[PDB]
Amino acid sequence: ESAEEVWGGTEDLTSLSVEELKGLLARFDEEEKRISYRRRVIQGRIDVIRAEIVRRGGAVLSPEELARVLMGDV
Amino acid sequence: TRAARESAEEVWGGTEDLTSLSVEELKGLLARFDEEEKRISYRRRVIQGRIDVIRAEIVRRGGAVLSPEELARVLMG
Ligand SMILES: Nc1nc2c(ncn2[C@@H]2O[C@@H]3COP(=O)(O)O[C@H]4[C@@H](O)[C@H](n5cnc6c(=O)[nH]c(N)nc65)O[C@@H]4COP(=O)(O)O[C@H]3[C@H]2O)c(=O)[nH]1
Ligand SMILES: Nc1nc2c(ncn2[C@@H]2O[C@@H]3COP(=O)(O)O[C@H]4[C@@H](O)[C@H](n5cnc6c(=O)[nH]c(N)nc65)O[C@@H]4COP(=O)(O)O[C@H]3[C@H]2O)c(=O)[nH]1
DSSP states (O other): OOHHHHHHHOOOOGGOOOHHHHHHHHHHHHHHEEEEEEEHHHHHHHHHHHHHHHTSEEEOOOOOHHHHHHTOOO | OOHHHHTTTTSSSSOOOTSSSSSHHHHHHHHHHHHHHHHHHHHHHHHHHHHHHHHHHHHTTTTOOOOOOHHHHHHOO
């Protein structure tokens, strides 16, 4: 929370100390871990939604075809 | 890879069986999902942009200093 604002008024980084950067880094890292996770998940759910469109209906996908779809070829 | 799944109470919130959705609805869901995907990938970009900037500054001055002793224990067990 305090990370979003301090990073906006801190202007340049030398004004901070190392043990303060370790703090900004920590609270910005996991926010990136879960935003990237949430990203890859919905990105994968899009490849199966688009793949579903071309299989015309209730396409149950064998573990064989899921690999192809998840790479990008839906 | 675990903390994300815990706070991911909204990523699998009201999801539906994609093999049950009708062809018409799939296109309607593709639109909604395509908009959040492009919005989370931007916030992702600007965020990881900060991280690289702050990680560079740290390494520049003090850095990830880890005494060869403690580091050995990390690699050992
Ligand atoms: N449906 C779907 N969409 C996807 C997938 N992966 C990425 N996208 C979306 O489409 C764009 C992908 O561009 P790219 O040609 O992979 O081009 C990417 C890629 O070249 C690079 N990039 C971003 N993150 C990474 C990463 O973690 N690793 C690598 N190697 N390149 C990355 O930055 C470019 C722009 O990324 P963004 O701004 O996020 O823009 C991304 C994102 O909005 C996927 O598997 N499925
Ligand atoms: N072509 C393409 N491939 C993609 C894209 N998004 C993800 N990938 C692939 O999927 C892997 C996992 O990405 P993640 O789970 O978001 O995990 C990512 C993400 O969390 C993070 N990352 C990616 N780019 C940056 C960056 O510029 N700064 C920081 N701090 N982290 C980054 O590190 C991991 C990157 O791992 P990579 O070795 O790049 O490995 C990436 C890359 O191989 C994309 O848009 N386009």
